[PDB]
Ligand binder design. Structure first.
Ligand SMILES: [Ca+2]
Lengths: 588, 145, 89
């Protein structure tokens, strides 16, 4: 941490203030050393501009007579800029100071009187895990990871004792903004701490279950919601009733339709429907509409493909921040899935251009046919819903991400199959090689095992016996890799794949939840509402779809005192358990 | 079968019901001293992979459609009568492509058909050993319970 | 009889000492423990989901340990009546 401080002080110093490198310790240096340990948080207590001007307070500045520089309140200068008695609060920043310094006692000693009970521990855990994953590499990394997961134990303990009492305010606790921590709703900071045990503490199950269903209560089954959504007037019959019908809030079928469509689960099964429907429509338009001219089916398949391009369009602008467009967007798109997302459009564009080119009129269709395999990947990429198959689908996601290089090993190794079998005959590098058979590219295999012997009518069998034996050897060198790489994370997964399940669920929903409730058939209304509205503004400033809430002062204080009291209750109980383990007995 | 429309298909439909009885065959054979506990193990594993069953079945639907993408579909046509695409009996493409009428690029995507079969062994045969290897401890003595 | 219902009252309330304290003078030695184990396992599988489920499952399987212990000591003696015990109505 101190080396990082020296680096950040030498990255942005000035020349005259101090000679080697030491101008001042400002909010700048701590701000960068935090931003390299955080994401989109807030910059604390004094931005640069005129309202809170800290710009030139490193050289003498003009006095009150201009009323534009400095403080403009006191006409006297005493070689100092003053002293604010309370920055915001001491404990929240003193935990930050102590955690990066890697001790046992001091962190807990300071926390024992923390006003912000839950968010400070999560922030400390996140910072400390980042310091673990940066660089110590021996003799400390595992111990202070154990300390981190101890902070997760302790956050679970305080959440336990706040779910002991006052369940209502307990669930509203999980949107803690605090107006001083870089709000993160107390959950974005939590999920950035990666939450080994935190995301499965019962109350969070109730939370993520009641937010997963918008205007949809209990007594709904997985097999029975399909009938509710598929059969459209049927919801108004004596079928499963909602609290809207129970409270007689369904005064109009239009109101029922609006309440149902805006439910989060509806858009998920809607994109389940529309994606496969678009795949079938691609098959339909490739299969009959092989007309370069714009026909009815050609425009029909253009419509939804352009809509999907618009959705990936919107995700691509939402990926980066307001300033760095290329850098962090490219960092996120360096992932194989996002690289394939770019490729799915680039390959389609290239294939269309080739098809319009007279040279590749026929090969254009073959080239465009290959792009469907990429969409096949999205098919099982998005199917993370099933209760028992879903965790296994996360497992297949991670295993294929791991064997992404075994993929290339297998593919490159096989190149010694056709070349090895074809070594008998002379190559054709500048010849008539292509036209009917040559060696590689796509379609006319008749050597599937069906050697054309129809023209026919001690030594010679065993090297072609050893071709199949060498296939058995392929089962030796390569099928071993599958079970091998699986058998490294094989313990206690069945019960602790629920943690990984919940984590990628929340990570996925955090950015996939901001999708419109209008169905693709009714997407023109949202288009006329927002897409033509975009052009008048440099940046789309639509209201951001989140579950955060604005906290008032009275409710803030009334809650915070309550977390402090239950923190005292947790601390005394904690002492009671620290009596229990036999270690205290032996040193007693 | 009594309906004149499906006089012949009735026999084919009735033939399929025998596979269900085949299930009862090993469902009821929980008697053998050493094979019996293993039969309880197969019962529980198939109950667990009942959804891997549907994953495997639905995923394979991208085999015949993918191979048949070369030729035009027949949705309102003479599609049925001798070959069309799916349902039950006359496969002659078991690997025996009818080449009897016959007499740098082109081999490797049909090389990759068998390589993709090896990939089926990758994504799917892993699931078997994987789900078995969650309850793998002290069973030989506590499968008696 | 009081003890048979007082075990039922105490078990659903999730304590260590009281259940055994009441059982120590139970007229119905074997069936009460089994009934308590069944009720307690159902309460485990219903809803606590953190910080208690495994501990009181361990308590349940302790009641199974203790039923095994009493069955051990009744199979120590009087084998005939020991096997006819297993039809307690
Ligand atoms: Ca990726």
């Amino acid at each position: 941490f101190h080396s990082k401080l020296q680096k950040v002080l030498v990255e942005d110093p000035e020349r005259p203030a101090c000679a080697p490198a030491a101008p001042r310790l400002q909010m700048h240096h701590v701000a960068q050393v935090l931003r390299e340990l955080l994401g989109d948080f807030t910059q604390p207590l004094y931005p640069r501009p005129r309202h809170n001007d800290r710009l030139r307070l490193l050289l003498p500045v003009p006095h009150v007579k201009l009323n534009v520089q400095g403080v403009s309140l006191r006409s006297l200068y005493k070689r100092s800029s003053g002293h604010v008695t309370f920055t915001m609060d001491p404990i929240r920043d003193l935990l930050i100071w102590a955690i990066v310094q890697n001790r046992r006692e001091l962190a807990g000693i300071i926390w024992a009187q923390s006003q912000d009970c839950i968010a400070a521990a999560l922030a400390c855990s996140k910072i400390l895990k980042e310091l673990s994953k940066e660089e110590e590499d021996t003799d400390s990394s595992e111990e202070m990871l154990a300390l981190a997961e101890e902070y997760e134990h302790r956050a679970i303990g305080v959440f336990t004792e706040c779910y002991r009492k006052d369940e209502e305010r307990a669930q509203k606790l999980l949107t803690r903004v605090s107006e001083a921590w870089g709000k993160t709703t107390c959950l974005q900071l939590a999920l950035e701490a990666k939450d080994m045990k935190f995301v499965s503490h019962g109350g969070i199950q109730a939370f993520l279950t009641k937010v997963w269903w918008g205007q949809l209560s209990v007594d709904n089954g997985l097999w029975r919601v399909t009938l509710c959504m598929l059969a459209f007037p049927l919801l108004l019959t004596g079928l499963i009733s909602f609290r809207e019908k129970r409270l007689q809030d369904v005064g109009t079928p239009a109101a029922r339709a609006r309440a149902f469509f805006t439910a989060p689960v509806v858009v998920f099964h809607l994109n389940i429907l529309s994606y496969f429907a678009f795949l079938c429509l691609f098959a339909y338009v490739l299969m009959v509409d092989f007309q370069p001219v714009p026909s009815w089916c050609e425009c029909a398949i253009y419509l939804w493909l352009f809509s999907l391009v618009c959705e990936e369009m919107r995700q691509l602008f939402y990926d980066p921040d307001e300033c760095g467009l290329m850098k962090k967007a490219a960092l996120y798109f360096s992932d194989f899935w996002n690289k394939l997302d770019v490729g799915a459009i680039l390959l389609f564009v290239a294939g269309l251009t080739c098809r319009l080119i007279p040279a590749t009129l026929y090969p254009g269709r073959v080239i465009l046919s290959l792009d469907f395999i990429l969409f096949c990947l999205r098919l099982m990429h998005i199917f993370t819903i099933s209760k028992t198959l879903g965790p296994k689908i996360i497992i297949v996601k991670r295993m294929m991400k791991d064997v992404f290089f075994f993929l290339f090993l297998l593919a490159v190794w096989v190149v010694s199959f056709g070349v090895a079998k074809q070594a008998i005959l002379i190559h054709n590098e500048r010849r008539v090689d292509w036209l009917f058979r040559g060696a590689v590219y796509h379609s006319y295999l008749t050597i599937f095992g069906q050697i054309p012997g129809y023209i026919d009518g001690f030594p010679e069998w065993l090297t072609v016996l050893l071709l199949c034996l060498y296939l058995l050897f392929t089962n030796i060198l390569l099928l071993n890799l599958l079970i091998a790489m699986f058998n490294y994370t094989f313990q206690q997964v069945q019960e602790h794949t629920d943690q990984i399940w919940k984590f990628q669920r929340h990570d996925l929903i955090e950015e996939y939840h901001g999708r419109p409730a209008a169905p693709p058939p009714f997407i023109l209304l949202s288009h006329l509402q927002l897409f033509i509205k975009r052009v008048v503004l440099k940046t789309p400033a639509k209201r951001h779809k989140q579950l955060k809430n604005k906290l008032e002062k009275n409710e803030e204080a009334a809650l915070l005192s309550w977390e402090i009291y239950l923190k005292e209750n947790y601390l005394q109980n904690r002492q009671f358990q620290q009596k229990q383990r036999p270690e205290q007995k032996i040193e007693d």
